[PDB]
Amino acid sequence: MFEITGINVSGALKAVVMATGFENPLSSVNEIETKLSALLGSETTGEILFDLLCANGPEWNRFVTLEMKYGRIMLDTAKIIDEQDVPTHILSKLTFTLRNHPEYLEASVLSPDDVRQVLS
Amino acid sequence: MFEITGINVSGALKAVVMATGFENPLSSVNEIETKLSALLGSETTGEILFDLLCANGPEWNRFVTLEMKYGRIMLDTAKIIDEQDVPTHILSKLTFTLRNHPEYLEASVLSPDDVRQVLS
Amino acid sequence: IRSYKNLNLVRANIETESRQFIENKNYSIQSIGPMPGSRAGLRVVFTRPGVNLATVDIFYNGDGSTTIQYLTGANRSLGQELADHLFETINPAEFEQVNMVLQGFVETSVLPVLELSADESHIEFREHSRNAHTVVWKIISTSYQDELTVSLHITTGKLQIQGRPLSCYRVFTFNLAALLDLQGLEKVLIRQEDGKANIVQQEVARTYLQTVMADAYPHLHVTAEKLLVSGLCVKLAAPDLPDYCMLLYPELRTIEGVLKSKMSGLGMPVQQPAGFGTYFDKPAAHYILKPQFAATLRPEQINIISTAYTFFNVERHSLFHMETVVDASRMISDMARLMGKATRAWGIIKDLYIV
Amino acid sequence: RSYKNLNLVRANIETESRQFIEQSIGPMPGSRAGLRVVFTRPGVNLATVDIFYNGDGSTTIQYLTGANRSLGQELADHLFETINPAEFEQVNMVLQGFVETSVLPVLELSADESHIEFREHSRNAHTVVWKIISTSYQDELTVSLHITTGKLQIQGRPLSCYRVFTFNLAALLDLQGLEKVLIRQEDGKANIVQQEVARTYLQTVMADAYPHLHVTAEKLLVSGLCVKLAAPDLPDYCMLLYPELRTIEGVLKSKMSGLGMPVQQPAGFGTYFDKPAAHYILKPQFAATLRPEQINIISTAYTFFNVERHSLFHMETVVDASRMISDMARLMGKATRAWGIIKDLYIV
Structure with a gap:
C-alpha cells in the first residue's frame, strides 16, 4: 500500500513514504511503523514525509508530514507541505519511482491528463 | 426491518409492507417473500404496496408498488404511487401503526416537524 | 422530472398551439373550453386510436402565468404530450422573472x-x-x-x-x-457581473444530460435523473469553490444504483448483508467478476460491469470517506479535474443502461 | 474609494489630464510601465501623480507619493469620474x-x-x-x-x-x-455565494470550534455553504448534505482515535457501539474511561452519521426507491443538526 523511497538515519526526514495506489497509506500506519523499524532504528524519532499522489491526485494536500516519537507515528501532528517546499531531490526520486512502476499509476486515482502532467 | 400492515387488501393488491426504521425494506426482499408466502398462498401473484416513510421521509417516493409473480417480488417493476392515489383505509391503517409503534418513528430518518406533520 | 406549474405561457396562443399540436400529432380533438367554474382556465380533451381519453387542465394564474395539470385524465401518459408541447413553447434560458x-x-x-x-x-x-x-x-x-x-x-x-x-x-x-x-x-439574454455564478435552470441542465445520455436517456430511472440533473444545475454554473467533491456525489451515487439494477437483471442480486465483495474479485488493480458469474455473460457485459464497479470503488474509496489523519483526505480543488471524472462517470452510466 | 485596477481606456490617457490648468507630461520613471505626471498646483509647489498600467487592461492610481502630492487626488478623482460608475468591473x-x-x-x-x-x-x-x-x-x-x-x-x-x-x-x-443594455438577470434570484460570505457564516455557526477545524473540513463545509446560501432550486438536495456527513465521518474518526479508539477499515465504527433501541451508544468497556459529555457527543455523532448516511450515500437495487430530499427546509434541518454535532465533536 506504500513504498519507502528514501531513508535518512541522520537527516531531518527519517523516511519518505509513497502511496502505491488509490488506498491511503495513513490507514495502514501500524504496518509502516514496523517496516521503518526494520529499516531504521527500532524507536526512531523525527519527521516522516508522505507522498499521497496515487491516493489523492496532484492536489494541495498531496504531501503531508507527521512526527514519529519512539518508533510510533503521531497522527495528530500532521502538517500539509506545499510542493514548492519539499526538496527537489525527494521530488525527483518520487518521479523516478513512479516511472519505474506504471502499475502504481494504473491503480491510482490519477487521470490521463494528471499522469502526463506529473510526467512532464 | 419491515412490517406487513395488511394482507389481501384488494384482489389486485395482495399486501402492504411498511418500513419500521431507517433501513430500506426492499434490500431484504427475500425475507418479505418468505413472510408473504407464509401469510398468503405459497406462490402468490399480484401487487405489493411499500410504504417507505421511515427510510425515505415524507417524500415523493414514499409509496412504491412492485409486481409479485409466483411468490417473488419482481424488482424491475417498481412504480411510484402518489399519496393521493393510495386508498384512505390503507393510509389510515399506516397512520394508526405509526402512532401505535412510536419506536418506528424513533428509528426513522424523520425530523420532529416531520414526525407531527404526517400525524395530523 | 419537469415542472409544469407557473409557466410563462403566451396566454393568447394556448388554444392555437394545443390544436396545432393535435394537428401534427394527428390525434383526434374531442373537447376544448374553459373549466366549469371557480377555476378560471382551459381544458383540452383528446385521444389516439385505441387508447383512453386524455384531459389536460390549463389553469390561469393571477400572476399572468399558467399551470398545466395532466395528472387528471383517463390517459395521463398522452396528456403529458400536450403538456410537454406547451412547455417547450418557452425559451428554457429565459428568466422566470x-x-x-x-x-x-x-x-x-x-x-x-x-x-x-x-x-x-x-x-x-x-x-x-x-x-x-x-x-x-x-x-x-x-x-x-x-x-x-x-x-x-x-x-x-x-x-x-x-x-x-x-x-x-x-x-x-x-x-x-x-x-x-x-x-x-x-x-440579449444575460448581462451581469462576470464573477457571479448562478445555478443553471433545471431544464437547461436536463437538456445537457440528454445530450450526454443520448440513447441512454429514455432509460434513466427518475431518481437517477433527479440526482444527475441536480449535480449539473451546480456543475454548469462553474462556481468558485474551495472544493468540488460535492459535485461528484451525484455521479457516484447514480453509478451504485444503476450497477445494482443491471446486476439484478442479470441474475446477480446485490443485497446489504453480502455486498459487491461476493460477486467480484481484485487480481491486482481492476476488480473482476468471479468465474461462476462471468461464465454466463458475454465479454461486453463483463467489461461494463467490471469497469463500473472498479470506477465506483476506486473513486468512492476516498471521496465518500475521510482519513483519521483528516487533512490527508482526498480533495478536488480544480473544476476541470472534477469534470473529467464526471464525464467518465457519465459514459459508464450510459453504457450500463445501453449495453 | 478604491483606486486600484481602474477600467480606464488604454488610449485617451495622455489627453485625459488637460482640462484642469492645461503642465508637463511623461511616462513613469524607471521600470514602472505607466505614467507619472508632474504639474504646477494652483499658487503652490509642484504636484505629482503616478498612475501605472497593470498586466491586463487595468490602471492603478497612486497619489500618496509626497512633495505636495495631495493635489494628485485631483487627477485621481477625474480618473474616478472618467468611467461609467454603474458598469461592472468585469x-x-x-x-x-x-x-x-x-x-x-x-x-x-x-x-x-x-x-x-x-x-x-x-x-x-x-x-x-x-x-x-x-x-x-x-x-x-x-x-x-x-x-x-x-x-x-x-x-x-x-x-x-x-x-x-x-x-x-x-x-x-x-x-x-x-x-x-447594462443588466439583464433573473429578478429576486440569489447568486452562488462568495467564499468569504460562506466562511463568515461557517465561523458564526461553528462557535468555539472554528479555530479547530481541519483544513479539509473547512474547505468542504465552505463549498457546501456557497451553494446552500444561494437557496437553489434543485430537483434534489441530497448532494448538499454530502459535506456535513463526510466531515462528521472525519471529525469522529480523529476524536475517537485520540480517545484511544483507532477506527480501522476492516472493523469500522461498529466495533465500539451497541444499538439497543434507536441510538448507538459507546460500549461499556470504552465508555468507562470517558466523561459523560464525551460519551454523549460520540454516540450522538455516530448515530446521526449512520442513520443519514445509510441511504444518502447508497442506492437501492430498485433505484426509484432510493432515499431522496426534494425540499430545502428539510435539507437545512439536517445540516443545522450536523453543524451542532461537528462543533461539539471539536469543543467537547
Missing part, C-alpha cells in the same frame, strides 16, 4: 413608448410613483392578468424593467426597440 | 441565436486593426470558445459559442478587445442597440 436595466434614457423618450404600448385593447399604464429622482410606472393587462414595473432613474438615465416576460413585457420591450433603435434587445 | 454577457458561420466573420473582421489579434481555444462539440487578444493594450476577451443552444457568451473587462468585438458584432449582424 426578468430584471433588465438599459442606459441613456430620459423621461421624454420613455413616456411615448409607454403610452403607445398602452394603445391596445388590454394594455394600460399607470403612474405608480414620482420621486423626482426615480419615476415608476406599472403596466397591467386585463386580458392576461400580468403586470410589469418600469422604473426610470432620471439623474442616472437608467430604465429598469421588472416582471414576468409575458404580455406587457413583450409589447413594451419591442415597442421601445422599434422607436429608439435598439435592435438587439430581443437577443 | 462583464459576462450572453446573447441568443448565433452559429459558427455567424461568429467567425466577426472575429476575423475585428482582428484587422492596429494591434488586435484573436486566438482559437478548445473546439469541443458541447460549446465552442475563442480567445480575442490585443497586442498593444494588453486585453483579452474570451468568447464562447455554445453549439447545442447557439448561445454567444462573451466575458472579460470592458477595455479594447471587448469594445471592438462588441462593435463588430453590433455592426455586422445588425444588433446595434446592444450598447444600451
Whole structure:
C-alpha cells in the first residue's frame, strides 16, 4: 500500500513514504511503523514525509508530514507541505519511482491528463 | 426491518409492507417473500404496496408498488404511487401503526416537524 | 422530472398551439373550453386510436402565468404530450422573472413608448410613483392578468424593467426597440457581473444530460435523473469553490444504483448483508467478476460491469470517506479535474443502461 | 474609494489630464510601465501623480507619493469620474441565436486593426470558445459559442478587445442597440455565494470550534455553504448534505482515535457501539474511561452519521426507491443538526 523511497538515519526526514495506489497509506500506519523499524532504528524519532499522489491526485494536500516519537507515528501532528517546499531531490526520486512502476499509476486515482502532467 | 400492515387488501393488491426504521425494506426482499408466502398462498401473484416513510421521509417516493409473480417480488417493476392515489383505509391503517409503534418513528430518518406533520 | 406549474405561457396562443399540436400529432380533438367554474382556465380533451381519453387542465394564474395539470385524465401518459408541447413553447434560458436595466434614457423618450404600448385593447399604464429622482410606472393587462414595473432613474438615465416576460413585457420591450433603435434587445439574454455564478435552470441542465445520455436517456430511472440533473444545475454554473467533491456525489451515487439494477437483471442480486465483495474479485488493480458469474455473460457485459464497479470503488474509496489523519483526505480543488471524472462517470452510466 | 485596477481606456490617457490648468507630461520613471505626471498646483509647489498600467487592461492610481502630492487626488478623482460608475468591473454577457458561420466573420473582421489579434481555444462539440487578444493594450476577451443552444457568451473587462468585438458584432449582424443594455438577470434570484460570505457564516455557526477545524473540513463545509446560501432550486438536495456527513465521518474518526479508539477499515465504527433501541451508544468497556459529555457527543455523532448516511450515500437495487430530499427546509434541518454535532465533536 506504500513504498519507502528514501531513508535518512541522520537527516531531518527519517523516511519518505509513497502511496502505491488509490488506498491511503495513513490507514495502514501500524504496518509502516514496523517496516521503518526494520529499516531504521527500532524507536526512531523525527519527521516522516508522505507522498499521497496515487491516493489523492496532484492536489494541495498531496504531501503531508507527521512526527514519529519512539518508533510510533503521531497522527495528530500532521502538517500539509506545499510542493514548492519539499526538496527537489525527494521530488525527483518520487518521479523516478513512479516511472519505474506504471502499475502504481494504473491503480491510482490519477487521470490521463494528471499522469502526463506529473510526467512532464 | 419491515412490517406487513395488511394482507389481501384488494384482489389486485395482495399486501402492504411498511418500513419500521431507517433501513430500506426492499434490500431484504427475500425475507418479505418468505413472510408473504407464509401469510398468503405459497406462490402468490399480484401487487405489493411499500410504504417507505421511515427510510425515505415524507417524500415523493414514499409509496412504491412492485409486481409479485409466483411468490417473488419482481424488482424491475417498481412504480411510484402518489399519496393521493393510495386508498384512505390503507393510509389510515399506516397512520394508526405509526402512532401505535412510536419506536418506528424513533428509528426513522424523520425530523420532529416531520414526525407531527404526517400525524395530523 | 419537469415542472409544469407557473409557466410563462403566451396566454393568447394556448388554444392555437394545443390544436396545432393535435394537428401534427394527428390525434383526434374531442373537447376544448374553459373549466366549469371557480377555476378560471382551459381544458383540452383528446385521444389516439385505441387508447383512453386524455384531459389536460390549463389553469390561469393571477400572476399572468399558467399551470398545466395532466395528472387528471383517463390517459395521463398522452396528456403529458400536450403538456410537454406547451412547455417547450418557452425559451428554457429565459428568466422566470426578468430584471433588465438599459442606459441613456430620459423621461421624454420613455413616456411615448409607454403610452403607445398602452394603445391596445388590454394594455394600460399607470403612474405608480414620482420621486423626482426615480419615476415608476406599472403596466397591467386585463386580458392576461400580468403586470410589469418600469422604473426610470432620471439623474442616472437608467430604465429598469421588472416582471414576468409575458404580455406587457413583450409589447413594451419591442415597442421601445422599434422607436429608439435598439435592435438587439430581443437577443440579449444575460448581462451581469462576470464573477457571479448562478445555478443553471433545471431544464437547461436536463437538456445537457440528454445530450450526454443520448440513447441512454429514455432509460434513466427518475431518481437517477433527479440526482444527475441536480449535480449539473451546480456543475454548469462553474462556481468558485474551495472544493468540488460535492459535485461528484451525484455521479457516484447514480453509478451504485444503476450497477445494482443491471446486476439484478442479470441474475446477480446485490443485497446489504453480502455486498459487491461476493460477486467480484481484485487480481491486482481492476476488480473482476468471479468465474461462476462471468461464465454466463458475454465479454461486453463483463467489461461494463467490471469497469463500473472498479470506477465506483476506486473513486468512492476516498471521496465518500475521510482519513483519521483528516487533512490527508482526498480533495478536488480544480473544476476541470472534477469534470473529467464526471464525464467518465457519465459514459459508464450510459453504457450500463445501453449495453 | 478604491483606486486600484481602474477600467480606464488604454488610449485617451495622455489627453485625459488637460482640462484642469492645461503642465508637463511623461511616462513613469524607471521600470514602472505607466505614467507619472508632474504639474504646477494652483499658487503652490509642484504636484505629482503616478498612475501605472497593470498586466491586463487595468490602471492603478497612486497619489500618496509626497512633495505636495495631495493635489494628485485631483487627477485621481477625474480618473474616478472618467468611467461609467454603474458598469461592472468585469462583464459576462450572453446573447441568443448565433452559429459558427455567424461568429467567425466577426472575429476575423475585428482582428484587422492596429494591434488586435484573436486566438482559437478548445473546439469541443458541447460549446465552442475563442480567445480575442490585443497586442498593444494588453486585453483579452474570451468568447464562447455554445453549439447545442447557439448561445454567444462573451466575458472579460470592458477595455479594447471587448469594445471592438462588441462593435463588430453590433455592426455586422445588425444588433446595434446592444450598447444600451447594462443588466439583464433573473429578478429576486440569489447568486452562488462568495467564499468569504460562506466562511463568515461557517465561523458564526461553528462557535468555539472554528479555530479547530481541519483544513479539509473547512474547505468542504465552505463549498457546501456557497451553494446552500444561494437557496437553489434543485430537483434534489441530497448532494448538499454530502459535506456535513463526510466531515462528521472525519471529525469522529480523529476524536475517537485520540480517545484511544483507532477506527480501522476492516472493523469500522461498529466495533465500539451497541444499538439497543434507536441510538448507538459507546460500549461499556470504552465508555468507562470517558466523561459523560464525551460519551454523549460520540454516540450522538455516530448515530446521526449512520442513520443519514445509510441511504444518502447508497442506492437501492430498485433505484426509484432510493432515499431522496426534494425540499430545502428539510435539507437545512439536517445540516443545522450536523453543524451542532461537528462543533461539539471539536469543543467537547
